[PDB]
Every structure is written in C-alpha cells, then in structure tokens.
Amino acid sequence: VPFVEDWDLVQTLGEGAYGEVQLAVNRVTEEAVAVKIVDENIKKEICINKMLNHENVVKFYGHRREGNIQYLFLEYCSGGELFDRIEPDIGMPEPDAQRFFHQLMAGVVYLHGIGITHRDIKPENLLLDERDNLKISDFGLATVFRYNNRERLLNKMCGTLPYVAPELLKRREFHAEPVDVWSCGIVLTAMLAGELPWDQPSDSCQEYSDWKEKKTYLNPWKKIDSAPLALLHKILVENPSARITIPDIKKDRWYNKPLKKPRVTS
Numbered sequence: 001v002p003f004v005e006d007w008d009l010v011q012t013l014g015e016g017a018y019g020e021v022q023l024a025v026n027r028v029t030e031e032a033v034a035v036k037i038v039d040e041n042i043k044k045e046i047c048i049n050k051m052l053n054h055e056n057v058v059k060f061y062g063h064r065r066e067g068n069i070q071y072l073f074l075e076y077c078s079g080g081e082l083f084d085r086i087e088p089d090i091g092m093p094e095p096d097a098q099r100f101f102h103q104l105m106a107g108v109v110y111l112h113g114i115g116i117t118h119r120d121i122k123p124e125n126l127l128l129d130e131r132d133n134l135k136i137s138d139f140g141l142a143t144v145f146r147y148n149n150r151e152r153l154l155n156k157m158c159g160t161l162p163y164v165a166p167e168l169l170k171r172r173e174f175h176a177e178p179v180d181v182w183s184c185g186i187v188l189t190a191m192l193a194g195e196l197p198w199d200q201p202s203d204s205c206q207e208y209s210d211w212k213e214k215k216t217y218l219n220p221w222k223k224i225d226s227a228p229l230a231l232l233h234k235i236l237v238e239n240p241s242a243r244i245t246i247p248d249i250k251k252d253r254w255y256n257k258p259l260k261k262p263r264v265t266s
C-alpha cells in the first residue's frame with residue numbers, strides 16, 4: 001500500500017541530551033509514534049531496546065540511520081509523563097499512586113529478569129498511555145548487569161542526584177538491583193507527598209540525616225499514611241544489602257492493600 005512508510009512530525013514531546021523527540025503521525029493510518037532524533041551511548045540504547053518486550057516498557061518499533069542523525073521509533077504515550085500527575089506539595093490520591101507503583105514494579109521486575117538496570121528511574125521517565133498505564137522510558141543510561149547468569153558490579157556514577165541510592169555516592173562498586181529499588185521508593189515518596197525528600201542521600205544533607213534519625217513528624221513524611229510509610233522505611237535503607245528486594249515489596253501490607261476501583265439503571 002503506497003505512503004504507509006510516510007510520517008508527519010506534528011509536535012515536540014521532549015528534548016534529549018543530544019537531540020529532540022517528536023510526535024509522528026502516519027500519513028495513511030494516522031497511527032501515532034514518538035521519534036527520537038540523536039546525532040557507544042545511542043548504540044547501547046538501540047541494542048538494549050531491541051531486547052525489550054513488556055506491557056510496562058515503552059515499545060521499540062525500530063531505527064533508521066540517515067548519515068549522522070539516528071531516528072528511533074518508539075511507542076507514543078498520549079497521557080504524557082507521571083511527573084505531570086503529581087500536584088506539588090500534595091502528590092496524588094493514594095489508590096492512584098499504588099496502581100502506578102504496581103505497574104512500575106512489574107516493569108522493573110521484567111527489566112531485572114533479563115539482566116537490565118535502567119539507572120534513571122524518575123517520574124519524567126515514566127510515561128502514561130491512553131488508559132493511564134505506566135511505561136518505563138529512556139534506556140540511554142541503561143546497562144547489562146547480568147550476562148550468562150553472572151552478575152557484574154557497577155561503578156559508573158549516573159542518574160539524577162535526588163533519586164540516586166547512597167552507595168552510588170559512598171562506594172566504588174555496588175549491586176545494580178538495589179539502586180533501581182531505591183529510585184522507585186523516591187518515586188513513591190514524590191507521588192504521595194508531592195515533594196522530593198532530599199537534594200542527595202548524603203550525611204551532609206540535613207533532610208537525609210533526619211530520615212536516618214526516624215524524624216517522620218517532619219515533611220514529606222508527615223503527609224504520608226503509616227501503611228505506605230512502613231514500606232518506604234524498608235526501601236529507603238542506607239545499607240543496600242539490608243534494603244528490601246522486589247519479591248519482598250510484593251508481600252508488603254500496603255502493596256497488597258485494596259484501594260482502587262458505562263452503566264444504566266432500571
């Protein structure tokens with residue numbers, strides 16, 4: 001069928017480190033896709049994306065190399081970013097945050113299962129489809145931590161300071177999985193309190209020192225109910241070896257708490 005391969009660029013969805021992301025509409029079918037234009041880091045992003053197939057991970061349709069500009073065709077999420085569902089200093093209703101946290105855990109369990117660590121989990125990288133289904137986005141910082149069933153320790157410092165785990169700032173080497181678990185706990189905090197707990201998880205940071213002293217009577221913790229706050233007490237643990245794993249998050253009381261729910265009468 002002619003012109004099925006032609007796409008029109010209608011709107012700017014985002015700006016990457018070395019390029020832009022545009023919403024592309026098919027000329028014949030009017031199907032919407034997101035096109036990432038990038039001029040060892042993009043080669044890794046295409047490669048890691050070629051491995052991914054999960055309902056909570058942004059789908060990779062393919063790539064086209066036209067000289068210097070690399071075109072990445074990705075699943076378009078019409079609901080935008082999770083970041084824009086978080087009301088500043090309020091957050092969002094607890095049943096919505098729980099549903100988004102379930103979908104985030106399903107995505108992260110998947111990624112860790114195939115030996116991939118995202119390394120930059122934050123609400124800007126969590127996209128929502130038309131039914132408000134959460135999708136993990138941007139594999140530009142992602143890496144393989146398990147290959148041929150052998151785990152490799154990470155040492156590269158990356159991500160976003162308010163979301164990074166404290167071992168990333170204190171240790172030369174660290175396990176990849178607890179680092180993503182910690183960033184999920186900061187996302188959960190932002191969803192329930194509408195604010196970030198600290199600038200970075202360091203002893204020089206007063207807000208972080210207050211958390212280690214269990215001063216939950218202060219912000220953001222005073223805004224969070226006791227059941228989700230008990231879960232955050234298990235995630236935001238400084239020692240990554242003592243930090244809760246995802247199989248144990250799936251057994252938490254708040255995680256399994258029932259919270260979220262066309263008809264005519266007579």
Ligand SMILES: COc1cc(-c2ccc3c(c2)Nc2ccccc2NC3=O)ccc1C(=O)O
Pocket residue numbers: 013014015016017021034036075076077078079080081127137138139140
């Ligand atoms: C894949 O990487 C990115 C992806 C995006 C991106 C892609 C698709 C969407 C989106 C952002 N944001 C968005 C914002 C408003 C409304 C709709 C969307 N939909 C997207 O699917 C932006 C930046 C990067 C980056 O490289 O930093």
